[PDB]
Structure 1
């Protein structure tokens, strides 16, 4: 981590020492981007994110990650609105507004 802080990345993990056994189908990456991993990123796309890459467990390139840690296509992400979690294709209408959840937004 100190090396990475100085911008040097070392592939030091190996089967004989300290492999990250990632949950479920997530894939270990030595340099992955955190900005667009979770489906909340879909629900809040205008929240700016410029964070550098980091090692960890990430979903495959075509899938986002939900609350359960399961990798899902963006069509299956829930939508977060006013702090409430709505399922895909959910619709609601209020005195003031009409909304519907699609593709995590």
Structure 2
């Protein structure tokens, strides 16, 4: 619904530490694991990175 509470402006998104930040340093939550805004990351076969909040995986 259209709820009531404490938000921050649309350019800013909520971070875990109470502050809210733009989507540049908004971490990724792949498989529960909290990855930093720039984390290149791969097993042998898969290839994944965190750009701006989303986790871009490939194969």
TM bucket by the smaller chain? 0.7 to 0.9
Answer 1 or 2: which has greater helix percent: 1
Deviations 1:17-56 (A, max 9, x none): xxxxxxxxxxxxxxxxxxxxxxxxxxxxxxxxxxx11110
For the residue of structure 1 that corresponds to 2:53, the secondary structure is coil
Give the RMSD, CA atoms, in angstroms: 0.9
1:89 offset after TM fit, Å? Answer: 1.1
The higher radius of gyration belongs to 1
TM-score (norm 1): 0.49
TM-score (norm 2): 0.84
Instruction: Provide structure 2 residue ranges, at least 5 long, that are not aligned to the other structure.
Output: 55-59
4+ aligned runs moved over 4 Å, structure 1:
none
Answer 1 or 2: which has greater strand percent: 2
Q: d(CA) in 2 for partners of 1:70 and 1:58?
A: 11
